[PDB]
Amino acid sequence: MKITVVDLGNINVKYVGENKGRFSSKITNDYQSYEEGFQRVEYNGIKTYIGVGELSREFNKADRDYMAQLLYSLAKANTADTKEINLTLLLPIIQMKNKTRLIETLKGENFKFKFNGIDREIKINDLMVLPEGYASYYSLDIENKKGDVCILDLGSRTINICVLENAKIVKTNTIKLGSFDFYSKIKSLENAKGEDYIEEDIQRLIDNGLIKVDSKQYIEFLSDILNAVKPYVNLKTYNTIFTGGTSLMLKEYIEKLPLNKFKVHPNALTSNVDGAMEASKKVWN
Amino acid sequence: MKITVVDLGNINVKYVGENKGRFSSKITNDYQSYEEGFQRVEYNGIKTYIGVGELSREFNKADRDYMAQLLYSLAKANTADTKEINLTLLLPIIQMKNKTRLIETLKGENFKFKFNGIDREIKINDLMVLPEGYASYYSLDIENKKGDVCILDLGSRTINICVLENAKIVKTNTIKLGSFDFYSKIKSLENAKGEDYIEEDIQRLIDNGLIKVDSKQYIEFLSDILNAVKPYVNLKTYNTIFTGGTSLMLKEYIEKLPLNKFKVHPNALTSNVDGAMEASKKVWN
Amino acid sequence: MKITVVDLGNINVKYVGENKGRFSSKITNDYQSYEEGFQRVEYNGIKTYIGVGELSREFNKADRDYMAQLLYSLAKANTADTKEINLTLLLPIIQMKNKTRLIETLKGENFKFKFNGIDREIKINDLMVLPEGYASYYSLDIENKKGDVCILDLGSRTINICVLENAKIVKTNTIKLGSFDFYSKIKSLENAKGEDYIEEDIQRLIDNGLIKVDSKQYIEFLSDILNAVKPYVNLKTYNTIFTGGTSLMLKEYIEKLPLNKFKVHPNALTSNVDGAMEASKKVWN
Amino acid sequence: MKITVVDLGNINVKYVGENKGRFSSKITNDYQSYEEGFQRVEYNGIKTYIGVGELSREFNKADRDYMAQLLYSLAKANTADTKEINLTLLLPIIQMKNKTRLIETLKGENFKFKFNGIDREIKINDLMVLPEGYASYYSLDIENKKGDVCILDLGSRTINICVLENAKIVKTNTIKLGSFDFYSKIKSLENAKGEDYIEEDIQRLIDNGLIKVDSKQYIEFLSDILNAVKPYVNLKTYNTIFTGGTSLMLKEYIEKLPLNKFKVHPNALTSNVDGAMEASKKVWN
Amino acid sequence: MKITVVDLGNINVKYVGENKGRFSSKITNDYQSYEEGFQRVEYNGIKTYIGVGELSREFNKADRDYMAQLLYSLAKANTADTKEINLTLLLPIIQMKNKTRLIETLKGENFKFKFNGIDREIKINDLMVLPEGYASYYSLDIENKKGDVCILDLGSRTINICVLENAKIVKTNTIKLGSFDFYSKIKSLENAKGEDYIEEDIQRLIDNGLIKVDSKQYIEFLSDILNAVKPYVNLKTYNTIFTGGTSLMLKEYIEKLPLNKFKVHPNALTSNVDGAMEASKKVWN
């Protein structure tokens, strides 16, 4: 009956159901003293604390312990009364076959968990999967759907390219690149001097004003990503829809490109979500 | 019982059966991630995606992998219930003998395929072949049949000339020329500057308004093609029926020629089809 | 006085001067910790490390930062004592006009750089440019020069066609295709399962024996490239000289083609170089 | 003349000269009653006792009081008669520039110290520095040098990655992680109940059989470290040489990994040393 | 109804209820002659004198005879008329589970005692527990709450670290270190000569001017404690709130640190108290 959409991502998780929201992808099984105060979930005896700790960089996220984050997001989005729902997940546009390994472990399965001590249960009627980026096309405005466009999702580690003709797809591909590599680049020179920064606590340093990120590093990253699209797409053609958090991160620099026609998707963070979410309304409803 | 007509072409495929239509000749065996969303056919274990990828420029189209496009067109035109049909193909007016290599591989053969996962089968009672251009004469209006006319099909790569006396043919020939050479000419100067266009994604650029095609390039192409007909035909004589997509592409420029009597065939795209299609009604029915 | 020839390429750079050689086209401006141990060049304050990092896929290589690779190759080929030389570059047979943008930035210019810390300078008397593929004709054996031949360079991203009559050219063209597309095809199915390969570290995987490249993928690539030459050349005619690294990559499969007369150029890697290099001896000497 | 190599480390110090050996990195300036019985060194009036006390966890070990441990190791390795030597230190592969701050304070300097009351002096002709991990490659067996390998040093607090092509480096990086974090994890749950353990006296508890370390904690640590290498290296590729004491600590669990090609370096403790030590023979001798 | 907060500590006890205050943690069951004149409490027949004698150094203070000090503090803070109250204790941020052993022995229990001969009774409605250091965050000023801060309590024997994001915690840990170790260090060299000082009567000697504490011993202690926080926190980041009596003891030396942003909490002695005390108002009121 209900519908829930979850983009696990690699650094951020974005959920939309009865209530929408997002949080950080950090997950840790490390033992903790003051359990009351943190967000956590316990499944079949193993406990995990969310929003802190490691980052789960493993590629092919079909098997990167997509276990605690999913249930936590389901509990946060919907309410306790809800028991049966329809899940619509978003996988990268290249790892589709892994959905076979997904459905087998989820479809028609009842999951019981704690969610900060308030034990509850949940079941899912049927599971559905959509490519990343392609989903966002549905959230796109009508004025851009008619034309031949290119959905370009700039993920933390994955760039997703989906070229759409007039309501049809032509090209689909993925690139191993994203903001994580930029964070690694920054830490490569920061940790060198005397410091101990890592890819996790580095963005907050930029936000609070400790790391002085020169404007041209963003330009270098822009050139690098745009150097990873020429073999597959000519960005001057195929009016482009930038999506993902990296797009918001680089928008003021993207807007000054030598591209005839383009734009940065509004609410890009949830775009890939909302789009797929719209698709759900089309299928079950 | 049923009758189906298929013009494979070189850039476009045009089918007419219980339901008519057309699509692009692009075919690719390349591996694909998001199979659901594309049009495809799998035959004896090998899968091909239609409407995208390469273009299959091979001449003598009797052997240019006329395999996936044919079955896809048959499935799209007719319905699943249909099992036996009569196929009427259109070959160029010079490669007739290759029909011997065609019939042997098709007549009395049952083909099973997927067509986007919905497996089905189909058989063909008997195969029939007609020259290109000659077919369109049947689709022609009565007012032009009586006079001595010249059917001139301007294909993407082949120009077909068939001179008809009063219900009889006198001259028949083919020329290696068409819109593909024009696309090559345009890309020769476009790719030179900084770009990466090819013969496939170049027409769409003209359509959407990126390539500024000067009016006189069309005139140059017109002179080139009309320079390829003087040895065989005097266009002032032999009232001319222009057919093919190139005719629609150049019609407003053809209409201003110093020719006493001529015309551009209506629905030229399907003309060569409809004509031959009429012929089928004459033979089996 | 001296003469130096440099084929920048897109994946490999090939230099010949007083000392010949080649290396990889990978270039990175990324910050590096252990600078001693890598090959690098610093120009006007910006440092670049060669043989590692990105790949610079940008087409129209007249402006793809042809800056560090050039100076590094000049330093490696010649010696420190040399100050003035004559440069003979090789551009694709379609981007000639870009030579105007080249000469202006190079002719009569003195470049100072580090080359792994040993600072040095160099000047170039005059600059010269030759088409790709056409150059290799000079390196060709005499037995093939007399006949009407077709120089076919199979680059990593560009196919160069130059048809030569008896010591004269007739046809000249370029196609966007090469081994880079093959690498993209392989990674399209490899990255899908669970992996993280890209177009850079994929050839080494084939070489060391991790990727199982089926024999028929090479055949598919051969058909694709040979499907990109029919509109311009009939390979049965115009005895063919295959050049480029891709020719060595596919030679044992090229040798089994239904072509009456052909061959694979020896030392094809440097052929395009040596040929043009011979031309230099003709002009200045 | 003589050559001495010193790996200060963070928990253990490893020296090799005329006589090889190792000891603990614990250093304390705390006042002591029974000075006779402990190992100590007094430099310019300040006394320090080695093998007991604090642990000097400060990162960027270029300035973590690398003062008493160094002289103590020099005295223990060589003999009293020796006056002039050549020092070859090992720094992490990311803090190279700090060598500038090192040489200035050491090169051409005479150090006098007590070494348990037997006053002596020593001078160093010239100082040399090598990256950690990279050094161990020289100690590696010939059978592994030819292939493209990955030196992976698992330090107490630092993971050092150095990817070597055929006798050349491609990738170099550091991660803040090691056995110290594992000790912190263990104490996090041990100290909680009633105890007072710290990161220093915790390994001895495991060795003597008081802390019951479940087998799966080692697996968790293995996954954590292997989660810190995917962005930079694919361990299935790049045949891996594990080095460092942590490798010996986890070897029986490393040996059961799903890695096609790998190994644990013999005498890993001194590997990083011996390797660099070999390098010294190449330079001065 | 009433609310009472008690920080037992290890050397000092700090109570706040209807009347606030503090005293020394010294407790002795030793027989005493002149009982009138000392502060004491007798519980179930056993008498204890407060403010003199031993010091109760036992770690895991959930069971270090937290019996007489508690009742004495309750009697001193509130008045005789009060019978029922709500207790809010402060435990270290690592020994939470011991609260289970606490509540069972206190919740819903009536305690009768003497308190210097004036017999009285008291009951507690419900018991509540909070981590040390975390509590002080509530007492903190608003200007520091919004930012990502680090509460650092420097106890007599325990260092408590609690890293707070924007109103949320991320890291929580404890270290065995404090002013008691400093007192032990001082006595190690004082008792050596001819004296008989211990960890109890040593601070008073500093206060009254008998022990000449060199300024650099405080610096050594500062470095030692700051050497015990690098693995868990980078003090340059995470604006720091120093709390505890040791902070007041070292404040003039803390203020001269190379830290960009920090401060010493006002009334740090009661900070950990007041904070938790505020929390009580939030829960019951």
Ligand SMILES: Nc1ncnc2c1ncn2[C@@H]1O[C@H](COP(=O)(O)OP(=O)(O)O)[C@@H](O)[C@H]1O
């Ligand atoms: N409000 C914001 N302002 C600036 N940058 C943001 C904001 N929200 C997210 N980002 C950036 O966008 C990135 C999030 O990418 P994300 O969409 O989580 O990757 P993926 O889609 O692959 O999961 C982060 O690295 C973050 O720096």
Ligand SMILES: Nc1ncnc2c1ncn2[C@@H]1O[C@H](COP(=O)(O)OP(=O)(O)O)[C@@H](O)[C@H]1O
């Ligand atoms: N609706 C249209 N408007 C303008 N041009 C068209 C249209 N449809 C087709 N064309 C042009 O006609 C050509 C199609 O030729 P086609 O009939 O497919 O060749 P062939 O008959 O040899 O298969 C294309 O190159 C296209 O540019």
Ligand SMILES: Nc1ncnc2c1ncn2[C@@H]1O[C@H](COP(=O)(O)OP(=O)(O)O)[C@@H](O)[C@H]1O
């Ligand atoms: N010794 C060799 N053996 C097998 N393949 C090779 C060898 N040398 C080069 N190649 C292949 O040839 C290609 C080099 O093409 P290249 O000549 O650099 O392109 P371009 O001429 O466009 O710069 C590479 O992709 C590589 O796989």
Ligand SMILES: Nc1ncnc2c1ncn2[C@@H]1O[C@H](COP(=O)(O)OP(=O)(O)O)[C@@H](O)[C@H]1O
């Ligand atoms: N003989 C041994 N048996 C088991 N474990 C050992 C042995 N020797 C050292 N170790 C482990 O290896 C670690 C030493 O790491 P080390 O090489 O000193 O770090 P670094 O290289 O960063 O200085 C220690 O934590 C210790 O537990």
Ligand SMILES: Nc1ncnc2c1ncn2[C@@H]1O[C@H](COP(=O)(O)OP(=O)(O)O)[C@@H](O)[C@H]1O
């Ligand atoms: N007014 C003061 N002036 C100077 N130092 C003080 C003062 N009050 C307390 N101290 C110091 O602070 C310490 C008290 O620490 P405390 O907060 O009791 O530890 P805990 O919080 O672990 O119980 C004592 O060692 C004392 O020397």
Ligand SMILES: [Mg+2]
């Ligand atoms: Mg994403």
Ligand SMILES: [Mg+2]
């Ligand atoms: Mg046709």
Ligand SMILES: [Mg+2]
């Ligand atoms: Mg080339």
Ligand SMILES: [Mg+2]
């Ligand atoms: Mg080490």
Ligand SMILES: [Mg+2]
């Ligand atoms: Mg305290």
